[PDB]
Every structure is written in structure tokens, then in C-alpha cells.
Amino acid sequence: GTITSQDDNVVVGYWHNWCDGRGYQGGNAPCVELKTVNPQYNVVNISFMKVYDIAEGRIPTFKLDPTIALSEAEFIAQIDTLNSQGRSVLIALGGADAHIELTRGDEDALAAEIIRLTDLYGFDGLDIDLEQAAITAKDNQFVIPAALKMVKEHYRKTGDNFMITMAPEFPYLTANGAYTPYLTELDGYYDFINPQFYNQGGDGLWIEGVGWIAQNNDALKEEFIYYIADSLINGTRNYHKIPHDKLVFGLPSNIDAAATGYIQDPQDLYKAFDRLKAQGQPLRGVMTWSVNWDMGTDAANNSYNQQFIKDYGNFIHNQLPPV
Ligand SMILES: [Ca+2]
Ligand code: NA
């Protein structure tokens, strides 16, 4: 089909290639068909491209989990339907226990497999979503950017914008931090970054007049969102610069989706986003782990009832487009 790229605000949601994931508070995340995903998720990230068995070699791939009971052809057709709705479907590279440890020279085969998978399934791009251990494993910092440059150029040749996004854990975005080689090598190739502002416990930043602002402090959630974003979009307070029109604020769907980082009161985000807007630096959207958790249950089997997309969908979609 058609590589479908995004020009306006985004609400990004990850999609699990597995069934019945266990939550941090004992809940459950079903596998769901793509066609079931709320349409306000206009970027949907297939999780994950990885190495399934090292006996198959170093190059990660994607294999649709048959437990999902969705044929190759049907998956393809559901991606095509999303594309017809103006929604992008990315392949997410990495995740926990991905076994991605590439050696220099592997970039050619990696690029090949990205293209093959993209052309097979009709993916619109790829999200770099490496686990902690992978960020600086072997030659990943060289190989992954090298391959992605080659993929971007491949599709630029027929007038297509293969999307590149990344999901760094935010503490790795300090100046000269471990994620910065991905950002610098792919400056001018990446479409937007959706960092994970969750699962980092008490990590945070100090601000004069406010104090220590932690990612796990619910009383200072507005100040967390505002100041971490402000630092990133300006390259201040010892953070690497990601421009506001390419920054998307990554969050847990609910308290089962991540250990920490869930926003108890959505108005803290509305307020933080509107401050960033008022200073001429509106962000590009939000991201969540995950559509499956947004559609999951708590430990007592109560539906989460799509609370994340209800809280943020309209807020984000009804903003002006980016510059
Ligand atoms: Ca906080
Ligand atoms: Na497509």
C-alpha cells in the first residue's frame, strides 16, 4: 500500500504482539486486533521487532504471534484500513529481552530486513525502542543509525517519507547521554521523539524556587512535565535539545502499564502543555504504553475502559497543527 506519514499532532500507542501481559498491579492486557484500536491513536507501534532466537542470527525480525488468531493477510488488511483512515503503523525495534547486539557491518542486512518487513506489512516507519542493556550494546549505536539512514534514502527515492521515531527513557537524554548518538546521527532523518517519562522512579530535575521535581511525585506532576519538556525543547539544564515540534510526551496508560509515571490528574498535563504552547513551543503530542493496557483490566477484572485516550485524545487532536 502507501507509506502513511504524519504532518500534524500525534497520539502514539504501542500494540502488543502477545496476549495477556501481566500488569505492575496484577492487571491484564489482552491481545486485540488492530481494527479494535481506538482511532484517536493515529500512530500505532507494533511491538516488537527483535531476535527471537540467537540461532537465527543477529538480525532482528518480526513474527506475528499466532495466539492473536490473525492471519498475515488480515493483519496486512487491517494496516491498510488504518492507512486509509490517515493513521500510521510503525514497527517498534527493541523492547525487553530483544537480544539486539549488532556488529559493524550488520547495517546492510538490518536495512534489508526493515525494507522487507515494511514492504510486506505496509509499515509507515520504525520506532527505536531499545531496552536499557541495548542502548550501548556492541555496535548498536553505529549500526542502527547507519541502517536507518539507508532505509530513509531508499524510500525517499520514490517520494516516500519512511517515518523514524524513538522512545528513549528520559534520563538518557542528558547532554552527552547514552542516547545522544542516536539523536545526532539521525538529526534530519527522525520525524519525532516520544521519550518514556515513566519507569524511572525518583529521577527528575532541580528547579530554583520549586525544588527537586521527581518523575514519581504526583504533587508536582505539572512542574515535572513543564520543566523536563522545557529543558529538552531548549537544550537547557543539561539536556540534549529535541525541538518542540518533534517532541511527544510518553506516558503509561494506567498504573498497570508501568511501575511509576502515570498521571493521576490529567489537568496537570493540560496545564503543562498549555504553558509550553503559550511560550511559542507547543509539543507535537503524547505517546502511551499502551493501547492494550488502555483496553485491559485491573487485578479485580475491572475494565480500564480506554481512560487514557478519553483523557488526552481530544485535547491533543483539537490543537493547531505544528510548525
Ligand atoms: Ca511527577
Ligand atoms: Na503503509
TrEMBL record:
The lineage of its organism: Bacteria, Pseudomonadati, Pseudomonadota, Gammaproteobacteria, Alteromonadales. Disulfide bonds join C19-C31. Residues 9-307 form the GH18 domain. Keywords: Calcium, Carbohydrate metabolism, Glycosidase, Hydrolase, Metal-binding, Signal. Ca(2+) binds at A214, N217. The keyword 4Fe-4S does not apply. This is chitinase. Its EC number is 3.2.1.14. The gene is chi60. N-acetyl-D-glucosamine binds at A96, W289, W293. Belongs to the glycosyl hydrolase 18 family. Chitinase class II subfamily. The chain holds residues 23 to 345 of 550 of the full protein. GO terms for cellular component: extracellular region.
